[PDB]
Design an enzyme around this catalytic site. Structure first.
Site, short mmCIF file in Angstrom:
data_model
loop_
_atom_site.label_atom_id
_atom_site.label_comp_id
_atom_site.label_asym_id
_atom_site.label_seq_id
_atom_site.Cartn_x
_atom_site.Cartn_y
_atom_site.Cartn_z
CE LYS A 53 -3.66 -2.38 2.59
NZ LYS A 53 -4.77 -2.26 3.57
N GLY A 69 2.61 4.83 -2.12
CA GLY A 69 3.38 5.21 -3.28
C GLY A 69 4.65 4.38 -3.29
CB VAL A 70 5.15 1.18 -1.50
CG1 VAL A 70 5.26 -0.17 -2.19
CG2 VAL A 70 5.91 1.21 -0.19
CE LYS A 122 0.43 -2.29 -7.20
NZ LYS A 122 -1.02 -2.22 -7.52
CB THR A 123 2.67 -0.82 -10.74
OG1 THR A 123 1.29 -1.18 -10.61
CG2 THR A 123 3.07 -0.86 -12.21
CB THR A 124 8.05 -0.08 -10.65
OG1 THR A 124 7.94 0.83 -11.75
CG2 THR A 124 9.51 -0.49 -10.50
CG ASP A 180 -3.39 -0.45 -9.28
OD1 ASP A 180 -4.25 0.46 -9.30
OD2 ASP A 180 -2.33 -0.37 -8.61
CB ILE A 232 11.50 2.87 -13.96
CG1 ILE A 232 12.78 3.33 -13.27
CG2 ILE A 232 11.78 1.66 -14.84
CD1 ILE A 232 13.17 2.45 -12.10
#
Ligand SMILES: [Zn+2]
Lengths: 296, 62, 280, 67
Positions: free
Chosen positions: C23, C25-26, C28-30, C54, C250
């Site tokens: 959870k 702005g960690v 995650k998706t990258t 997401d 990225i």
């Protein structure tokens, strides 16, 4: 409109109780010292008390001198004093944990009644009574739970050596509530940083506070870069401002004050005073930048 | 009358949730949070009507 | 003796399900894209699927090409494909989560009917994607109570439960950054996962500065390392992998591949610094 | 009450742990602090299980009482 600073609070002559809190590395303790320093300077006629239940003993660390259960004037200030106390110790000394914890708000109430005793003990003995108190609340737990007590306490009384002390607590707590629910007497100041989790945690805090009929109009946002005035910093700032824009939309009628990040930790009266002014007059990255750099 | 207004708010609450989960709390945090406030408001209403409903029932035995 | 990287996972031939979540702005998706890219490259013989529930549609944004309910090979990779789906929409088409999840399983087998050997789930940053994970427990209890009626007048899901509680088949990878709130939220996530008998040995810590190799950055890094030292004490038997912060976002296969290698071999601020700067 | 004397014993322990954990900074001590949090949950779980044994034990006695 609503100014992005604490000036109205800082110069307020009505307020006897200012609560400051937030969870995380959000910079809570520094905010509490700033708020207390600002009021003290702005109101030389009134005597202020800053007290912290934070176990980490952050006050002594921030001012650079030792504080304790005994109220001391912070060296360099004649109107501001500090107290650092452990409420859990204060409980353990005097002291059915099942019976207490079973009901929400009793454990906190007993912890709090201990800090009130300490305060009036510092006022009586010396003879110097405080006009306004600033509470640096513990970063964890829910400190104000005891505010919904009477409602849930009088509801459990109607249906149902022990009876007396309970009703006595209900009474004391209602007497307090009559204070803490008066927006002119009491208010809460939230401390966050601009990041999702801090902002979420800050929203829930606000809601909980509203449920106690506690007045909260004020949010301090710390550790802001204002980088446009280092590629890494620049990017981080881009995010901070992303959420900043939405904070402003979320609480319009709030005073949401934006505080600049300072490299290293701010300590000692001097640095604190110089930093704390940005609570009264909003920091401007353009003009005020020199003040921030000289703290490093 | 009453019992209908309840079932309709449970529907509304549902529709709101389905929507809020279609948006990013990260990007939309302002809107997202507003919606969260409304959801709590409804949950408070739904649980008010459940009370009224079951109450006028238990009292209906007269 | 537990390496601070995902290599064992990345080269794992047993795992059919990798869950990635966190959870905030960690990042995650990258992380999900990196993990999927690394496995794909390291195992050219196997076909991988990366799917994201997401809502923000982060996959298409990260790879720089459009993805959807229909599995597409990511251009430049012949073993990796992507799916972006909305389980709400599919829905309308632990009980609430279960119904949402059964929709993504249908989509997957519909894309196969080219079969995928291993799936990487980028889980929604909010709510709980895996309340279903707790479901094959709850769903099989629906079948235990259901069959209870028959005698008066399943194994299909059961083997799913077995597959999700099988550490060699399935594992969860947590994504956090070194700050109090993220780390707290990450702990609770781990606990919830353990309660489902879901295997989680892996934590990715993103956005680390390694500044000692800007006075502001330097200080921030001093904090990040404060918590870093304690993370290492908190989960000893975990693979806790430390990932460098990259300025800007990225995107594209190239930058992603170059960045994703630090999951396999731990980034070294001393030697690897040049790789990070060239991405900026 | 081999059972009941435990319920009070572990409720006391759980209490003492909490009082302690709130005497330490989760910020500075986060490793220890979190460990303690884990233990607290462990106890709360043993507490609720005992609470249920009692409810289950007394319902078993009142059944023998009816029979
Ligand atoms: Zn910097």
């Amino acid at each position: 409109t609503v100014e992005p600073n604490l000036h109205s609070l800082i110069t307020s002559t009505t307020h006897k109780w200012i609560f400051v809190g937030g969870k995380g590395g959000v910079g809570k303790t520094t905010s509490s010292c700033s708020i207390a320093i600002q009021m003290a300077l702005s109101q030389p006629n009134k005597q202020f008390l800053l007290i912290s239940t934070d176990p980490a003993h952050n006050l002594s660390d921030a001012f650079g001198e030792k504080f304790g259960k005994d109220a001391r004037k912070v060296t360099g200030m004649n109107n501001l004093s500090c107290m650092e106390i452990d409420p859990s110790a204060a409980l353990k000394d005097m002291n059915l944990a099942d019976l207490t914890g079973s009901i929400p708000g009793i454990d906190e109430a007993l912890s709090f009644m201990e800090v009130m005793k300490h305060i009036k003990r510092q006022e009586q003995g010396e003879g110097e009574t405080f006009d306004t108190v600033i509470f640096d609340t513990a970063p964890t737990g829910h400190t104000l739970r005891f505010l919904q007590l009477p409602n849930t306490l009088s509801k459990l009384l109607e249906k149902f050596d022990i009876s007396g002390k309970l009703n006595e607590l209900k009474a004391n707590v209602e007497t307090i509530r009559q204070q803490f629910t008066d927006p002119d007497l009491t208010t809460f100041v939230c401390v966050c940083i601009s990041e999702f989790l801090s902002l979420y945690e800050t929203e829930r805090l606000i809601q909980e506070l509203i449920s106690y009929d506690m007045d909260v109009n004020s949010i301090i946002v710390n550790q802001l870069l204002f980088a446009e005035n280092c590629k890494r910093c620049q990017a981080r700032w881009k995010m901070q401002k992303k959420y900043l824009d939405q904070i402003d939309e979320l609480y319009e009628d709030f005073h949401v004050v934006k505080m600049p990040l300072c490299a290293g930790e701010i300590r000692g009266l001097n640095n604190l005073t110089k930093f704390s002014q940005f609570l009264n007059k909003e920091y401007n990255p353009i003009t005020d930048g020199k003040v921030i750099y000289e703290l490093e | 009358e009453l019992s209908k207004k309840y079932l309709a708010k449970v529907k509304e609450r549902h529709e709101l949730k389905e929507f809020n989960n279609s948006i990013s709390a990260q990007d939309n945090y302002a809107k997202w949070t507003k919606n969260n406030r409304k959801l709590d408001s409804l949950d408070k209403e739904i649980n008010n009507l459940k009370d009224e409903i079951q109450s006028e029932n238990k009292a209906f035995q007269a």
